[PDB]
RNA sequence: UAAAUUAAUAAAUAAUUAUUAAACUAAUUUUAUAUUAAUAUUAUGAAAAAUUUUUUUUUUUUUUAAUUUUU
């Protein structure tokens, strides 16, 4: 239309799809350090990472081992069928934060003693629920005596 | 029912003994006691003892 | 207690400065709690930036543990997993 | 009876155009960026192009269709290596949503930068212009 | 530099069905927040957006029959935004002014 | 080291995955008698199973009208797939009498969740986790009909749980599994492997809401002994 | 290539002329 | 636009420093019912005082934004962990049950701050200001308090940043939170 | 350690004159043979037995002027999805079906188009009013999609097609249980 | 006591524990408040208010085992005369200028 | 921009000889068919007009008020611990053990 | 060939798992999530 | 805060672009700030700024071996200055510099397995000398114009500085039109380099 | 999986591997990460010059699998 497309705008950053194409054992540890942060360990895996600055650094140092794609934030909502009237920050607010392998904690002990207190909140939630039916059953049966007095 | 091979951990009986040199020393009760440290003199030789009693 | 000096050592060898008390048992109670590295001498908290010392053994142990190839690589030189397996061992003798 | 899904909603774009139309084949040249060596898809790029993954026992009509069913039409229950698949294909989405979910927050608070690249990339490649 | 009448050629082109802007402004954020010289048929861009290439979708297809007329207070700061366009192909981008643009109020 | 799980991780094995059997009534015990004590031709089931899971997903989404349709179809293909009064054709309507009630049509709800029971007692040994799913729908459509006299069926439903639900077999294998872990300070999350009875024993989880939907009744009508008649049972 | 000793596994013959 | 509300003393009084669109709105003082709900008032007030040591998260409302703002129905908040609103924690270290719905904690009058929960029983760290007479939230969500001052501010947020779905068109958050009296 | 000398002592029956007789010398042999079967099975048996098959499907392609170099690239181009052991089964038992394939890959027939992504129906955007009785517009179409795909599969005489003979009536099987 | 909890971190947490301790365990929060102010040696002489408060919360909760103390007795022992004269009679003074700036 | 189709091939991809067919036979068809189609959110105010429709069902908190015509929700009629009796088949794989998503 | 060249958005194809697989009622504007949270959650057969 | 004496940036007589012999030029001013480098002020090559000196200075012209030729400090001059210096500032670097290459070569090498492009070198000149350049201004020596650089050891080639006439810069540098850039390609390993 | 090293008045830890135990927060993807203590263990051996190829030692069975052209 020979003019700058005008109006209220948006901005749609990218999203990468990286995959190893070479054995990461061959290189130093400084590089495979940058390949764990991409959640990549073996030739042939794949992941989908944002394009935010702290990820271009980790990719700038492994550019000879990965192959990169670039998905925009309309291709994403199109690759998977998503209505345009949905965003992504709200659609992601549904899945809990304790997904498979919830998050990365420093040690493998701190990964265990975190999965432990998640197997405890299940025990507790079953016990607290049984505690109410001993607290409710009480208060009423605690009233039957008083209710007898009036 | 295992052999606490030092610097290697518990090992099966009948297992591998190739890496249990210093373990065959501890069992014999033989104590080197870190005596290859000739160079660094411990507080033992340089500690003035008060009190001829103690 | 903010230092702003070349602060001191602790109270190993003590010249006692009394004010008023029973006090007839100071240097017999000032060399009694001085060998267990202790209070009962009030310990004179000095050197408010002792963080730079917790960040030395943070670096002097993360730069000497990387002297042996820090290796978030793997169990080093895998090359035989990445197909699939359960790695066994290799006794050190080295 | 047999099955052929090839998608989650089926809805396959039928291939046969019309009793006289042209066939409209797909371009067999692998997407090489420089164009001089002039390659051709190699039996494992066709397999990627056709909806499978690297090997066709992956991410295709070879797993997502059940192996069998009972003659009366009763399906077959799930297995350990079936649930572990469905969770994986849901991981390949949560990896993408949570990824786009953080880009949104970065681009809605204007945190994503404007100079394209790192501080150490522009200081490496000359073709990324000066700012 | 650019005669204020060249802008007046946009007095009769933005009125057409394509209400797209015919002028950008590489101005500092308060500089555009302190002055009402941005309202009619003009869009804001940071010069690190055109150069880096973030403003490629919002830029006309016909790269030969296309004008920009970037606006800025400084001179060096202005041509350092026009030259970002030549990096992307456009020609009729001139770094018009900062004051002559403040006057096409209709 | 850790595991990224960035590739496809095949499942582990575990004794929580044993195919736990169903629950029934004893041999001669018939439902209407127990209560008052207190080959096939091809049908695309595999496709209609996908067609009712979109009802379970829908009726659980608040779209109770759309769910009614998806349930309508799958309840049609079932009264043809299975013979009369099959334990399955009776159970699908229990998803229909609910989907009815959540659309005003209570008159058909009770007409549905009461039709199932004559398929259940007239059977040989009915699925016990169903007769507590029917006797729940029969107790919920009576609420929607606002009849307090029609509310003492929960306590009669759980009368079958307390009687005919051997509450051991839900957690028989899972009982010793904490004795499987052999590490104490790493991978020690195996010494506390806890499986929850609400998530593992459905009939128990059903029998709980009965004894919680029955409490709210007696709490609503300002009934005292009724509440305690339930709470002590919900604890027991 | 795959145990460099020598490769005696039957190789494929080139394609006939069109 | 006046908020009727029940006046009593000797109760924990908590204040919030809300800020939508980065615009300093003002302080919102809450009166917690320690007369009927001792526990829920202690989990709440604790997260507002920030005195508790970090457990599963940093137990503190300062900074966390409101995340479910339905104009005219409910303005949600809390969310110590996973600032989008998908995680419910508590200072006792576990989601804890609801105490009582008998008096002053069963009715969700417009002057009320409910204690949102994931399960009907296991309450957590998420609260909500009942902006209308929610006849259905009776004895489901344990009411725990009532706003004393600043009712215009929560009436500002529910309008400035609202959507029938719930997502905020702008980020309204707690710039600071502390105990008042 | 544990020589597995219990199992490997029954095997000493099928060895030659020395390993069969003396228990020691038989173990060093049978544990040398069994340790090289498992060494050849997991390492080298594939790359050899996997090329006696790519030679049989190839040699069976030269009888049609083509070869494995071309066949391999065009069994995939057409999405045919045949294991390289299956093409050897056809080339040896069903020689016509193989030939029939070899004509297809040589034909100028359009390969099947790549599977489509997920398309948002229009009705997802179509603004729904405040109407509680009628179902959502998208379900009345998606459900129709599910029942057509339900009847297209197989030739199930659904009680000799006793269920609703037409689709708009099959979507009304919820009114069949109303009074 | 508030402006003390607001002045220094030393007095804040002890106050917020006392500010909302139980009616059952009050006079303990004041004791564990006196214990910290005493250890981190304060002008324990001129700070006798926390003693009186501890004697006010003990005159209830066993009224018969300890003597009786009123809230006025506590306020009697306070660092006052900063507010009564030089500060209270400073407030209204500024308010007078506000009248010679209106006029 | 909101009004435009919004599908924008990058200059580098356009420049390279990576051009592929259309109407089918391009893996990018289902996408570039979905991106070239007219955009619904033609304006940031037409944006909300679509978004004032969809609900957030499973979100933690006070559930939405019903539409006055649909019965009371499943969740309060069936509690939270329970879930509908999903059919367990190869192709309907419902979420198993749903009482672990709590944290 | 040594290094293949394909749009690597193909190596993880989203045909058998669109968001309609993890959000069942989305085209019905409902936005409900029913994911499979971990391989470890698997109930049984 | 412009540092106290960690910087001075005092106007100039002559001879920036330090070398062994560095006064290769004809009549201008350009320098590096004399912070402790005030050693200039000792015997010329820089003069403290003054209300007089901001009008002009006695730049060293080399024609008479003394700071004879006056020079004005108008716009054109300062315009002409950087345009002139920046030219040979490129010359001073690539002439005196020596750019190393971590490259890859398999077997007993003697040769690179991926020969050097021209865009390859034009990345190094920017990487190591911070000198931005047009790659096409690099003309490989007449030995390897058809096969890249491709060789280990010590190679060289011709970067072409076009702008010799418009700045009137001759007889001070031994090649007015092109400058020999010297390279030295190593054999780095897989951990060493990419490509 | 090679790392450690100061004889001798008031300066935070030898290092390794091993056994046994311990704790997540100013410190971002909604990424990733083996840190701490107690005890057991100190002999695996370079001389010059120059200088400021590669990841493999180790595989549960069936398939599946992308690094080949001569002078």
UniProtKB/TrEMBL annotation, chain A:
Which superkingdom heads the taxonomic lineage of this protein's source? Eukaryota
Keyword annotations for this protein, in alphabetical order, are: Membrane, Transmembrane, Transmembrane helix
Q: What is this protein called?
A: Ribosomal protein L30 ferredoxin-like fold domain-containing protein
Taxonomic lineage is:
Eukaryota, Discoba, Euglenozoa, Kinetoplastea, Metakinetoplastina
- Show which stretch of the intact protein is covered: 243 to 392 of 409
TrEMBL record, chain D:
Q: What is this protein called?
A: Uncharacterized protein
Q: What is the lineage of its organism?
A: Eukaryota, Discoba, Euglenozoa, Kinetoplastea, Metakinetoplastina
Residue window of the full protein shown: 1 to 85 of 186
From TrEMBL, chain F:
Superkingdom in the source lineage: Eukaryota
Q: What is this protein called?
A: Uncharacterized protein
Parent protein range shown? 107 to 392 of 503
From TrEMBL, chain L:
Which family does the record assign?
Answer: Belongs to the universal ribosomal protein uL15 family.
What is the protein named?
Answer: Large ribosomal subunit protein uL15/eL18 domain-containing protein
- Taxonomic source organism: Leishmania major
Residues represented out of the complete protein:
10 to 54 of 374
């Amino acid at each position: 239309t020979t003019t700058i497309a005008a109006g209220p705008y948006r901005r749609v950053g990218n999203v990468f799809i990286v995959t190893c194409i070479d054995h990461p054992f061959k290189f130093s540890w400084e590089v495979n350090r940058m390949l764990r942060e991409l959640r990549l360990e073996f030739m042939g895996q794949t992941t989908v990472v944002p394009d935010i600055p702290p990820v271009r650094k980790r990719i700038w140092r492994v550019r000879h081992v990965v192959r990169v794609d670039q998905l925009d934030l309309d291709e994403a909502k199109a690759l998977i069928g998503i209505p345009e009237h949905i965003s992504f920050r709200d659609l992601a607010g549904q899945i809990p934060p304790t997904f498979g392998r919830g998050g990365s904690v420093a040690n493998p002990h701190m990964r265990s003693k975190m999965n432990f207190m998640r197997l405890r909140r299940m025990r507790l939630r079953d016990v607290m629920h049984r505690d109410q039916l001993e607290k409710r059953l009480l208060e009423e049966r605690h009233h039957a005596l008083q209710q007898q007095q009036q | 029912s295992g052999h606490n091979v030092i610097k290697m951990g518990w090992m099966k009986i009948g297992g591998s003994w190739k890496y249990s040199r210093s373990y065959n020393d501890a069992r014999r009760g033989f104590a080197k006691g870190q005596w290859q440290e000739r160079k660094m003199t411990p507080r033992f030789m340089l500690a003035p003892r008060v009190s001829a009693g103690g | 207690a903010a230092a702003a000096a070349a602060a001191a050592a602790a109270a190993a060898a003590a010249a006692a400065a009394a004010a008023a008390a029973a006090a007839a048992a100071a240097a017999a109670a000032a060399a009694a709690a001085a060998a267990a590295a202790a209070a009962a001498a009030a310990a004179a908290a000095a050197a408010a930036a002792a963080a730079a010392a917790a960040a030395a053994a943070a670096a002097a142990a993360a730069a000497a543990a990387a002297a042996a190839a820090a290796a978030a690589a793997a169990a080093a030189a895998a090359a035989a997993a990445a197909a699939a397996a359960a790695a066994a061992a290799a006794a050190a003798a080295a | 009876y047999s099955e052929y899904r090839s998608s989650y909603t089926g809805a396959r774009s039928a291939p046969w155009a019309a009793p006289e139309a042209a066939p409209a084949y797909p371009s067999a040249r692998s997407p090489f960026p420089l164009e001089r060596p002039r390659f051709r898809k190699t039996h494992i790029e066709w397999m990627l192009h056709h909806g499978h993954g690297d090997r066709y026992g992956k991410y295709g009509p070879s797993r997502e269709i059940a192996d069998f069913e009972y003659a009366d039409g009763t399906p077959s229950s799930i297995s350990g290596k079936r649930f572990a698949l469905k969770h994986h294909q849901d991981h390949l989405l949560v990896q993408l949503i949570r990824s786009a979910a953080i880009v949104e927050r970065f681009e809605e608070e204007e945190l994503l930068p404007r100079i394209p690249g790192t501080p150490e990339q522009r200081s490496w490649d000359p073709e990324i212009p000066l700012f | 530099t650019v005669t204020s009448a060249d802008m007046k050629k946009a007095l009769l082109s933005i009125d057409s069905t394509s209400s797209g802007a015919l002028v950008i402004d590489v101005r500092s954020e308060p500089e555009r927040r302190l002055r009402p010289l941005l309202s009619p048929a003009i869009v804001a861009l940071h010069p690190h957006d055109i150069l880096s290439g973030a403003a490629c979708p919002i830029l006309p297809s016909n790269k030969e029959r296309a004008e920009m007329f970037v606006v800025a207070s400084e001179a060096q700061r202005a041509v350092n935004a026009c030259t970002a366009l030549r990096r992307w192909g456009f020609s009729r981008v001139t770094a018009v002014s900062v004051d002559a643009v403040s006057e096409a109020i209709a | 080291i850790t595991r990224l799980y960035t590739s496809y991780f095949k499942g582990e094995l575990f004794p929580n995955q044993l195919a736990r059997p169903l629950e029934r009534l004893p041999r001669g015990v018939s439902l209407a008698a127990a209560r008052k004590g207190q080959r096939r031709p091809y049908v695309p089931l595999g496709e209609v199973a996908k067609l009712e899971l979109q009802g379970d997903y829908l009726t659980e989404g608040g779209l109770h009208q759309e769910a009614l349709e998806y349930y309508g179809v799958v309840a049609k293909a079932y009264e043809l797939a299975y013979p009369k009064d099959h334990p399955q054709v009776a159970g699908i309507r229990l998803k229909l009498a609910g989907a009815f009630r959540r659309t005003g049509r209570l008159t058909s709800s009770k007409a549905n969740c009461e039709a199932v029971l004559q398929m259940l007692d007239s059977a040989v040994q009915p699925p016990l986790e169903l007769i507590v799913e029917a006797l729940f729908e029969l107790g919920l459509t009576s609420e929607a009909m606002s009849d307090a006299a029609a509310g003492t069926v929960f306590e009669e439903a759980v009368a079958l749980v307390d009687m005919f639900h051997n509450s051991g077999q839900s957690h028989k294998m899972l009982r010793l599994l904490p004795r499987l872990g052999r590490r104490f300070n790493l991978n020690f999350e195996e010494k506390f492997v806890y499986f929850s009875p609400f998530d593992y024993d459905r009939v128990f989880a059903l029998a709980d809401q009965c004894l919680e939907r029955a409490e709210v009744f007696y709490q609503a009508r300002n009934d005292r002994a009724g509440v305690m008649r339930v709470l002590q049972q919900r604890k027991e | 290539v795959y145990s460099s000793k020598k490769d005696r596994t039957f190789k494929v013959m080139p394609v006939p002329p069109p | 636009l006046y908020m009727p509300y029940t006046p009593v003393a000797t109760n924990p009084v908590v204040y919030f420093d809300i800020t939508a669109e980065g615009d300093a709105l003002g302080r919102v003082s809450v009166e917690l019912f320690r007369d009927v709900v001792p526990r829920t008032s202690e989990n709440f007030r604790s997260l507002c005082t920030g005195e508790r040591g970090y457990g599963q998260c940093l137990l503190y409302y300062k900074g966390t934004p409101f995340h479910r703002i339905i104009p005219g129905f409910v303005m949600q908040g809390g969310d110590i962990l996973t600032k989008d609103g998908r995680s419910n924690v508590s200072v006792f270290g576990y989601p804890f049950p609801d105490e009582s719905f008998e008096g002053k904690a069963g009715k969700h009058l417009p002057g009320t701050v409910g204690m949102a929960h994931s399960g009907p029983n296991q309450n957590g760290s998420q609260f909500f200001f009942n902006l209308g007479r929610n006849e259905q939230l009776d004895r489901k969500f344990v009411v725990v308090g009532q706003v004393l001052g600043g009712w215009e501010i929560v009436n500002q947020v529910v309008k400035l940043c609202g959507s029938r779905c719930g997502t905020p068109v702008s980020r309204a958050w707690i710039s600071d939170c502390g105990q008042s009296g | 350690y544990y020589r597995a000398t219990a199992e490997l002592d029954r095997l000493r029956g099928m060895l030659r004159g020395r390993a069969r007789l003396e228990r020691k010398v038989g173990l060093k042999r049978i544990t040398f043979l069994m340790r090289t079967q498992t060494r050849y099975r997991v390492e080298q048996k594939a790359h050899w037995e996997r090329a006696i098959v790519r030679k049989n499907v190839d040699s069976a392609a030269h009888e049609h002027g083509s070869g494995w170099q071309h066949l391999r690239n065009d069994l995939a181009r057409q999405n045919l999805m045949l294991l390289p052991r299956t093409q050897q089964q056809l080339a040896q038992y069903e020689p016509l079906a193989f030939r029939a394939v070899m004509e297809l890959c040589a034909s100028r027939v359009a390969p099947p188009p790549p599977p489509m992504t997920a398309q948002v129906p229009e009705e997802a955007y179509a603004t729904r009013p405040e109407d509680p009785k009628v179902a959502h517009p998208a379900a009345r179409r998606q459900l129709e999609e599910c029942v057509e795909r339900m009847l297209c599969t197989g030739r199930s005489d659904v009680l000799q097609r006793e269920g609703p003979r037409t689709t708009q009536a099959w979507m009304d099987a919820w009114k069949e249980y109303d009074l | 006591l508030q402006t003390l909890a607001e002045c220094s971190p030393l007095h804040h947490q002890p106050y917020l524990s006392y500010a909302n301790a139980e009616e059952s365990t009050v006079a303990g929060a004041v004791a564990e408040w006196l214990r910290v102010c005493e250890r981190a040696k304060l002008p324990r002489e001129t700070r006798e208010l926390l003693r009186k408060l501890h004697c006010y919360h003990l005159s209830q909760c066993h009224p018969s085992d300890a003597t009786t103390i009123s809230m006025e007795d506590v306020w009697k022992a306070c660092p006052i005369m900063h507010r009564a004269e030089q500060s209270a009679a400073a407030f209204v003074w500024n308010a007078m200028a506000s009248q010679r700036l209106l006029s | 921009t909101f009004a435009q189709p919004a599908a924008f091939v990058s200059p580098r991809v356009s420049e390279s000889a990576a051009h592929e067919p259309d109407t089918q036979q391009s893996s990018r068809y289902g996408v570039d068919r979905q991106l070239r189609g007219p955009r619904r959110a033609v304006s940031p105010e037409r944006l909300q007009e679509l978004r004032e429709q969809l609900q957030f069902v499973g979100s933690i908190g006070p559930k939405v008020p019903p539409a006055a015509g649909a019965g009371t929700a499943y969740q309060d009629e069936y509690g939270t611990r329970l879930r509908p009796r999903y059919p367990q088949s190869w192709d309907t794989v419902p979420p198993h053990q749903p009482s672990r998503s709590e944290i | 060939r040594y290094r293949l060249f394909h749009p690597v958005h193909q190596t993880v194809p989203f045909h058998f798992n669109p968001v309609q697989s993890i959000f069942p009622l989305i085209y019905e504007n409902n936005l409900l999530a029913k994911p499979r949270l971990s391989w470890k959650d698997y109930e049984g057969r | 805060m412009a540092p106290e004496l960690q910087l001075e940036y005092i106007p100039i007589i002559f001879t920036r672009t330090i070398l062994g012999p560095q006064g290769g030029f004809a009549g201008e001013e350009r320098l590096i700030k004399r912070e402790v480098a005030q050693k200039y002020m000792s015997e010329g090559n820089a003069v403290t700024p003054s209300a007089e000196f901001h009008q002009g200075v006695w730049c060293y012209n080399p024609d008479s071996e003394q700071y004879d030729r006056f020079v004005e400090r108008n716009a054109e001059f300062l315009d002409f200055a950087a345009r002139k210096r920046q030219w040979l500032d490129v010359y001073w670097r690539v002439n005196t510099g020596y750019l190393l290459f971590g490259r890859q070569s398999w077997g007993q090498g003697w040769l690179l397995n991926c020969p050097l492009r021209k865009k390859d070198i034009a990345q190094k000149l920017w990487e190591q000398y911070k000198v931005r350049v047009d790659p096409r201004l690099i003309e490989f020596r007449e030995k390897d114009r058809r096969t890249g650089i491709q060789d280990l050891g010590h190679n060289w080639c011709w970067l072409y500085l076009p702008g010799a006439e418009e700045l009137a810069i001759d007889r001070e540098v031994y090649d007015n039109k092109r400058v020999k850039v010297r390279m030295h390609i190593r054999k780095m390993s897989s951990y060493g380099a990419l490509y």
